[PDB]
Amino acid sequence: PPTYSELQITRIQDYLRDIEKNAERFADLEVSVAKGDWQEARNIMRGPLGEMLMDMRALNRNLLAKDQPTPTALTRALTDDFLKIDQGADLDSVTVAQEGFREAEADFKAYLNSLPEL
């Protein structure tokens, strides 16, 4: 019956560190969106939070196959939530963008709660 290897465990630990460090910029994203500062909102999404998504995908690849569906689905969800923020920005609508933000925050919290016991 599959168990995590030391290598997987160490990689997970390192990717999760990076994910949680980059996740601090959710706050800056929310403020930029509230101000309709679309250029900074896109910079945040493309930069630190884009790195965060890359780190999530890398983490997910290191999970046991039985543990992969949920985190993977939620990473795709979060990717699409950022697109929703960008659709708000294109419409120059704070209101639409903040609905995307709320979905992104909920999906990211759900992603962390989906990670396995190692």
mmCIF file with all atom_site columns, C-alpha atoms in Angstrom:
data_model
loop_
_atom_site.group_PDB
_atom_site.id
_atom_site.type_symbol
_atom_site.label_atom_id
_atom_site.label_alt_id
_atom_site.label_comp_id
_atom_site.label_asym_id
_atom_site.label_entity_id
_atom_site.label_seq_id
_atom_site.pdbx_PDB_ins_code
_atom_site.Cartn_x
_atom_site.Cartn_y
_atom_site.Cartn_z
_atom_site.occupancy
_atom_site.B_iso_or_equiv
_atom_site.pdbx_formal_charge
_atom_site.auth_seq_id
_atom_site.auth_comp_id
_atom_site.auth_asym_id
_atom_site.auth_atom_id
_atom_site.pdbx_PDB_model_num
ATOM 1   C CA . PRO A 1 1   ? 0.000   0.000  0.000   1.00 0.00 ? 1   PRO A CA 1
ATOM 2   C CA . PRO A 1 2   ? 1.531   3.361  -1.178  1.00 0.00 ? 2   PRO A CA 1
ATOM 3   C CA . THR A 1 3   ? 3.235   5.632  1.307   1.00 0.00 ? 3   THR A CA 1
ATOM 4   C CA . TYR A 1 4   ? 5.093   8.903  0.842   1.00 0.00 ? 4   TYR A CA 1
ATOM 5   C CA . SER A 1 5   ? 8.852   8.706  0.229   1.00 0.00 ? 5   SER A CA 1
ATOM 6   C CA . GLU A 1 6   ? 11.371  11.006 1.905   1.00 0.00 ? 6   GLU A CA 1
ATOM 7   C CA . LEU A 1 7   ? 11.929  12.695 -1.375  1.00 0.00 ? 7   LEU A CA 1
ATOM 8   C CA . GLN A 1 8   ? 8.263   13.396 -1.917  1.00 0.00 ? 8   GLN A CA 1
ATOM 9   C CA . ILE A 1 9   ? 7.894   14.659 1.611   1.00 0.00 ? 9   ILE A CA 1
ATOM 10  C CA . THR A 1 10  ? 10.822  17.050 1.326   1.00 0.00 ? 10  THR A CA 1
ATOM 11  C CA . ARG A 1 11  ? 9.628   18.377 -2.061  1.00 0.00 ? 11  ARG A CA 1
ATOM 12  C CA . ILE A 1 12  ? 6.083   18.896 -0.699  1.00 0.00 ? 12  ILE A CA 1
ATOM 13  C CA . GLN A 1 13  ? 7.450   20.751 2.295   1.00 0.00 ? 13  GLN A CA 1
ATOM 14  C CA . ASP A 1 14  ? 9.522   23.052 0.095   1.00 0.00 ? 14  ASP A CA 1
ATOM 15  C CA . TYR A 1 15  ? 6.752   23.790 -2.441  1.00 0.00 ? 15  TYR A CA 1
ATOM 16  C CA . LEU A 1 16  ? 4.244   24.428 0.374   1.00 0.00 ? 16  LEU A CA 1
ATOM 17  C CA . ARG A 1 17  ? 6.680   26.903 1.960   1.00 0.00 ? 17  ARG A CA 1
ATOM 18  C CA . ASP A 1 18  ? 6.871   28.793 -1.271  1.00 0.00 ? 18  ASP A CA 1
ATOM 19  C CA . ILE A 1 19  ? 3.115   28.617 -1.862  1.00 0.00 ? 19  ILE A CA 1
ATOM 20  C CA . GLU A 1 20  ? 2.384   30.067 1.569   1.00 0.00 ? 20  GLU A CA 1
ATOM 21  C CA . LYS A 1 21  ? 4.999   32.803 1.234   1.00 0.00 ? 21  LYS A CA 1
ATOM 22  C CA . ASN A 1 22  ? 3.640   33.902 -2.169  1.00 0.00 ? 22  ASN A CA 1
ATOM 23  C CA . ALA A 1 23  ? 0.035   33.631 -0.814  1.00 0.00 ? 23  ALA A CA 1
ATOM 24  C CA . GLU A 1 24  ? 0.771   36.611 1.410   1.00 0.00 ? 24  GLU A CA 1
ATOM 25  C CA . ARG A 1 25  ? 0.263   38.694 -1.734  1.00 0.00 ? 25  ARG A CA 1
ATOM 26  C CA . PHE A 1 26  ? -3.457  37.876 -1.805  1.00 0.00 ? 26  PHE A CA 1
ATOM 27  C CA . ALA A 1 27  ? -3.821  40.895 0.445   1.00 0.00 ? 27  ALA A CA 1
ATOM 28  C CA . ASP A 1 28  ? -2.103  43.215 -2.012  1.00 0.00 ? 28  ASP A CA 1
ATOM 29  C CA . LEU A 1 29  ? -4.190  41.774 -4.827  1.00 0.00 ? 29  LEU A CA 1
ATOM 30  C CA . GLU A 1 30  ? -7.415  42.523 -2.942  1.00 0.00 ? 30  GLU A CA 1
ATOM 31  C CA . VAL A 1 31  ? -6.376  46.140 -2.254  1.00 0.00 ? 31  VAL A CA 1
ATOM 32  C CA . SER A 1 32  ? -5.323  46.676 -5.889  1.00 0.00 ? 32  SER A CA 1
ATOM 33  C CA . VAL A 1 33  ? -8.577  45.285 -7.130  1.00 0.00 ? 33  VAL A CA 1
ATOM 34  C CA . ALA A 1 34  ? -10.547 47.503 -4.683  1.00 0.00 ? 34  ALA A CA 1
ATOM 35  C CA . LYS A 1 35  ? -8.769  50.564 -6.103  1.00 0.00 ? 35  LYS A CA 1
ATOM 36  C CA . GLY A 1 36  ? -9.309  49.455 -9.734  1.00 0.00 ? 36  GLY A CA 1
ATOM 37  C CA . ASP A 1 37  ? -5.543  49.391 -10.031 1.00 0.00 ? 37  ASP A CA 1
ATOM 38  C CA . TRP A 1 38  ? -5.632  46.847 -12.748 1.00 0.00 ? 38  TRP A CA 1
ATOM 39  C CA . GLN A 1 39  ? -1.995  47.105 -13.735 1.00 0.00 ? 39  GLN A CA 1
ATOM 40  C CA . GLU A 1 40  ? -0.845  46.202 -10.219 1.00 0.00 ? 40  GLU A CA 1
ATOM 41  C CA . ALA A 1 41  ? -3.492  43.538 -9.823  1.00 0.00 ? 41  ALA A CA 1
ATOM 42  C CA . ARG A 1 42  ? -2.252  41.847 -13.084 1.00 0.00 ? 42  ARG A CA 1
ATOM 43  C CA . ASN A 1 43  ? 1.379   42.255 -11.947 1.00 0.00 ? 43  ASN A CA 1
ATOM 44  C CA . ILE A 1 44  ? 0.531   40.409 -8.734  1.00 0.00 ? 44  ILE A CA 1
ATOM 45  C CA . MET A 1 45  ? -1.386  37.676 -10.486 1.00 0.00 ? 45  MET A CA 1
ATOM 46  C CA . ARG A 1 46  ? 1.266   37.176 -13.130 1.00 0.00 ? 46  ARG A CA 1
ATOM 47  C CA . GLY A 1 47  ? 4.218   37.431 -10.693 1.00 0.00 ? 47  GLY A CA 1
ATOM 48  C CA . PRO A 1 48  ? 4.013   36.073 -7.144  1.00 0.00 ? 48  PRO A CA 1
ATOM 49  C CA . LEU A 1 49  ? 0.637   34.391 -7.476  1.00 0.00 ? 49  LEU A CA 1
ATOM 50  C CA . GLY A 1 50  ? 1.606   32.963 -10.822 1.00 0.00 ? 50  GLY A CA 1
ATOM 51  C CA . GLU A 1 51  ? 4.679   31.456 -9.116  1.00 0.00 ? 51  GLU A CA 1
ATOM 52  C CA . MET A 1 52  ? 2.329   30.200 -6.428  1.00 0.00 ? 52  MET A CA 1
ATOM 53  C CA . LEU A 1 53  ? 0.235   28.357 -9.065  1.00 0.00 ? 53  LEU A CA 1
ATOM 54  C CA . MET A 1 54  ? 3.401   26.845 -10.562 1.00 0.00 ? 54  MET A CA 1
ATOM 55  C CA . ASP A 1 55  ? 4.408   25.673 -7.064  1.00 0.00 ? 55  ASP A CA 1
ATOM 56  C CA . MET A 1 56  ? 0.919   24.145 -6.502  1.00 0.00 ? 56  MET A CA 1
ATOM 57  C CA . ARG A 1 57  ? 1.191   22.238 -9.731  1.00 0.00 ? 57  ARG A CA 1
ATOM 58  C CA . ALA A 1 58  ? 4.643   20.991 -8.737  1.00 0.00 ? 58  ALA A CA 1
ATOM 59  C CA . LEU A 1 59  ? 3.394   19.963 -5.280  1.00 0.00 ? 59  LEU A CA 1
ATOM 60  C CA . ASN A 1 60  ? 0.451   18.122 -6.845  1.00 0.00 ? 60  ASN A CA 1
ATOM 61  C CA . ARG A 1 61  ? 2.775   16.084 -9.105  1.00 0.00 ? 61  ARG A CA 1
ATOM 62  C CA . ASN A 1 62  ? 4.531   14.833 -5.955  1.00 0.00 ? 62  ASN A CA 1
ATOM 63  C CA . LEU A 1 63  ? 1.388   13.556 -4.287  1.00 0.00 ? 63  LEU A CA 1
ATOM 64  C CA . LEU A 1 64  ? 0.374   9.943  -4.240  1.00 0.00 ? 64  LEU A CA 1
ATOM 65  C CA . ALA A 1 65  ? -2.031  9.184  -6.990  1.00 0.00 ? 65  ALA A CA 1
ATOM 66  C CA . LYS A 1 66  ? -4.915  8.617  -4.575  1.00 0.00 ? 66  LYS A CA 1
ATOM 67  C CA . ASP A 1 67  ? -4.295  12.099 -3.083  1.00 0.00 ? 67  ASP A CA 1
ATOM 68  C CA . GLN A 1 68  ? -4.001  13.959 -6.385  1.00 0.00 ? 68  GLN A CA 1
ATOM 69  C CA . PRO A 1 69  ? -7.577  14.518 -7.666  1.00 0.00 ? 69  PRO A CA 1
ATOM 70  C CA . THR A 1 70  ? -8.787  17.065 -5.147  1.00 0.00 ? 70  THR A CA 1
ATOM 71  C CA . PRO A 1 71  ? -5.720  19.360 -4.958  1.00 0.00 ? 71  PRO A CA 1
ATOM 72  C CA . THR A 1 72  ? -5.435  19.224 -8.792  1.00 0.00 ? 72  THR A CA 1
ATOM 73  C CA . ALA A 1 73  ? -9.042  20.155 -9.291  1.00 0.00 ? 73  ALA A CA 1
ATOM 74  C CA . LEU A 1 74  ? -8.746  23.051 -6.912  1.00 0.00 ? 74  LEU A CA 1
ATOM 75  C CA . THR A 1 75  ? -5.572  24.311 -8.617  1.00 0.00 ? 75  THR A CA 1
ATOM 76  C CA . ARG A 1 76  ? -7.501  24.426 -11.880 1.00 0.00 ? 76  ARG A CA 1
ATOM 77  C CA . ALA A 1 77  ? -10.360 26.180 -10.043 1.00 0.00 ? 77  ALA A CA 1
ATOM 78  C CA . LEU A 1 78  ? -7.974  28.816 -8.693  1.00 0.00 ? 78  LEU A CA 1
ATOM 79  C CA . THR A 1 79  ? -6.414  29.322 -12.183 1.00 0.00 ? 79  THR A CA 1
ATOM 80  C CA . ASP A 1 80  ? -9.884  30.012 -13.544 1.00 0.00 ? 80  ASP A CA 1
ATOM 81  C CA . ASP A 1 81  ? -10.681 32.400 -10.566 1.00 0.00 ? 81  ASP A CA 1
ATOM 82  C CA . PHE A 1 82  ? -7.716  34.566 -11.627 1.00 0.00 ? 82  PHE A CA 1
ATOM 83  C CA . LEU A 1 83  ? -9.151  34.639 -15.150 1.00 0.00 ? 83  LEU A CA 1
ATOM 84  C CA . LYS A 1 84  ? -12.383 35.889 -13.564 1.00 0.00 ? 84  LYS A CA 1
ATOM 85  C CA . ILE A 1 85  ? -10.476 38.669 -11.853 1.00 0.00 ? 85  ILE A CA 1
ATOM 86  C CA . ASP A 1 86  ? -8.920  39.557 -15.214 1.00 0.00 ? 86  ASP A CA 1
ATOM 87  C CA . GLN A 1 87  ? -12.418 39.593 -16.796 1.00 0.00 ? 87  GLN A CA 1
ATOM 88  C CA . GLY A 1 88  ? -13.457 42.101 -14.117 1.00 0.00 ? 88  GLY A CA 1
ATOM 89  C CA . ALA A 1 89  ? -10.396 44.208 -14.861 1.00 0.00 ? 89  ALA A CA 1
ATOM 90  C CA . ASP A 1 90  ? -11.176 44.147 -18.594 1.00 0.00 ? 90  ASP A CA 1
ATOM 91  C CA . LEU A 1 91  ? -14.758 45.340 -17.763 1.00 0.00 ? 91  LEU A CA 1
ATOM 92  C CA . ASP A 1 92  ? -13.241 47.938 -15.417 1.00 0.00 ? 92  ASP A CA 1
ATOM 93  C CA . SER A 1 93  ? -15.528 46.525 -12.763 1.00 0.00 ? 93  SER A CA 1
ATOM 94  C CA . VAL A 1 94  ? -14.364 46.282 -9.136  1.00 0.00 ? 94  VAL A CA 1
ATOM 95  C CA . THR A 1 95  ? -17.540 44.503 -8.305  1.00 0.00 ? 95  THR A CA 1
ATOM 96  C CA . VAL A 1 96  ? -17.022 41.698 -10.855 1.00 0.00 ? 96  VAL A CA 1
ATOM 97  C CA . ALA A 1 97  ? -13.290 41.445 -9.971  1.00 0.00 ? 97  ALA A CA 1
ATOM 98  C CA . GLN A 1 98  ? -13.989 41.137 -6.252  1.00 0.00 ? 98  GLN A CA 1
ATOM 99  C CA . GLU A 1 99  ? -16.406 38.211 -6.890  1.00 0.00 ? 99  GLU A CA 1
ATOM 100 C CA . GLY A 1 100 ? -13.422 36.546 -8.636  1.00 0.00 ? 100 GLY A CA 1
ATOM 101 C CA . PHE A 1 101 ? -11.218 37.388 -5.644  1.00 0.00 ? 101 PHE A CA 1
ATOM 102 C CA . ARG A 1 102 ? -13.674 35.834 -3.185  1.00 0.00 ? 102 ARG A CA 1
ATOM 103 C CA . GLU A 1 103 ? -13.786 32.649 -5.304  1.00 0.00 ? 103 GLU A CA 1
ATOM 104 C CA . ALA A 1 104 ? -9.941  32.588 -5.521  1.00 0.00 ? 104 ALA A CA 1
ATOM 105 C CA . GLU A 1 105 ? -9.559  32.976 -1.732  1.00 0.00 ? 105 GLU A CA 1
ATOM 106 C CA . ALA A 1 106 ? -12.144 30.203 -1.130  1.00 0.00 ? 106 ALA A CA 1
ATOM 107 C CA . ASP A 1 107 ? -10.507 27.849 -3.687  1.00 0.00 ? 107 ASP A CA 1
ATOM 108 C CA . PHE A 1 108 ? -7.041  28.487 -2.201  1.00 0.00 ? 108 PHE A CA 1
ATOM 109 C CA . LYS A 1 109 ? -8.235  27.775 1.334   1.00 0.00 ? 109 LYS A CA 1
ATOM 110 C CA . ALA A 1 110 ? -9.945  24.608 0.056   1.00 0.00 ? 110 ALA A CA 1
ATOM 111 C CA . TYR A 1 111 ? -6.683  23.634 -1.709  1.00 0.00 ? 111 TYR A CA 1
ATOM 112 C CA . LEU A 1 112 ? -4.741  23.834 1.592   1.00 0.00 ? 112 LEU A CA 1
ATOM 113 C CA . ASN A 1 113 ? -7.421  21.794 3.348   1.00 0.00 ? 113 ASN A CA 1
ATOM 114 C CA . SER A 1 114 ? -7.142  19.130 0.608   1.00 0.00 ? 114 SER A CA 1
ATOM 115 C CA . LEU A 1 115 ? -3.422  18.382 1.242   1.00 0.00 ? 115 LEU A CA 1
ATOM 116 C CA . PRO A 1 116 ? -2.754  14.972 2.674   1.00 0.00 ? 116 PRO A CA 1
ATOM 117 C CA . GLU A 1 117 ? -1.376  13.697 5.844   1.00 0.00 ? 117 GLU A CA 1
ATOM 118 C CA . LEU A 1 118 ? 2.299   12.781 5.041   1.00 0.00 ? 118 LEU A CA 1
#
